[PDB]
């Protein structure tokens, strides 16, 4: 069933079905072997182009798409890399667009992040995706601004935190941000000053 609304509920229903580590595996196979994962990313890619070229129905569909990818990627193993490489590139592109959604893709991206060394593609995406627009003077504040400009809303931040929590778990590239800015991990922690400084003054416990 193709109708956009049926299609989105289908995605949601399957997410529910994906529950066990075991079920999640089947859901993985369902798309991979006997709609394919590729079709799914394609849809996301297409929406991305339409969104940017343009500059509720879509939110329904996209939100569902993400809800599903998230559910499985979380409950999976070596398979995670396979989905990772593939939604990773597309998801990154989607994040660049404004979207309401930003947070959600960040949550999914995080699920994709692997335990090992091959974090690097992800860190580059994140740094590039904060760094790109911002103009950084030689001081600290300008760096904070880069993050603040991009991570405008609450969902954006929570998603960002989940992704960061995952990447920071155990590793990252040397001389990160080289070329564009003063390198290193430090500015990210500064950003948290913006966050947990503020937290005390939340809304909404």
């Amino acid at each position: 069933l193709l109708p956009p609304t049926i299609y989105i509920p289908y995605l949601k229903m399957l997410q529910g079905l994906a529950n066990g580590p075991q079920c999640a595996h089947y859901c993985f196979s369902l798309l991979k072997v006997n709609v394919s994962w590729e079709h799914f990313f394609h849809s996301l890619m297409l929406y991305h182009e339409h969104l940017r070229k343009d500059l509720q129905k879509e939110q329904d569909g996209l939100i569902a798409f993400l809800q599903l990818t998230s559910t499985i990627i979380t409950w999976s193993e070596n398979a995670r890399l396979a989905l990772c490489e593939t939604p990773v590139v597309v998801i990154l592109g989607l994040l660049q667009c404004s979207i309401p959604l930003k947070a959600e893709l960040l949550k999914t991206l995080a699920a994709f992040g692997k335990s090992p060394e091959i974090a690097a593609s992800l860190w580059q995406s994140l740094e590039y995706t904060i760094l790109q627009t911002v103009r950084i003077p030689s001081g600290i504040e300008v760096e904070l601004n880069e993050i603040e400009s991009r991570c405008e809303e609450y969902p954006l931040t929570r998603a960002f935190c989940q992704l960061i929590s995952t990447l920071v778990e155990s590793s990252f590239p040397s001389n990160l941000g080289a070329g564009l800015r003063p390198p290193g991990f430090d500015p990210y922690l500064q950003f948290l000053r913006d966050s947990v400084f503020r937290f005390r003054t939340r809304a909404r416990a």
Binding site: T133, R135, P137, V142, N145
Partner: protein
């Protein structure tokens, strides 16, 4: 009251102009410190084209010299 009250009007006016200069100067520094950032350009150059023109117009050459003091 009126004749020596001109004083307040004139004084007020000069104060106005000095405050305008400070207003402008504070306005200007709020656009260098928050604003680089090193973002700044776009519209800025157009400002800057206008300003370039006016400035050495003036300069140079021509004006100054000749004129002001053939007159003085």
């Amino acid at each position: 009251n009126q004749t020596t009250s001109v004083a307040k009007i004139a004084q007020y006016k000069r104060k106005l102009m000095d405050l305008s200069h400070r207003t402008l100067q504070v306005l200007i520094k709020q656009e260098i410190q928050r604003k680089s950032g090193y973002a700044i350009q776009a519209d800025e150059e157009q400002l800057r084209v206008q300003l370039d023109t006016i400035q050495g117009e003036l300069n140079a050459p021509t004006q100054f010299k000749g004129r002001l003091n053939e007159l003085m």
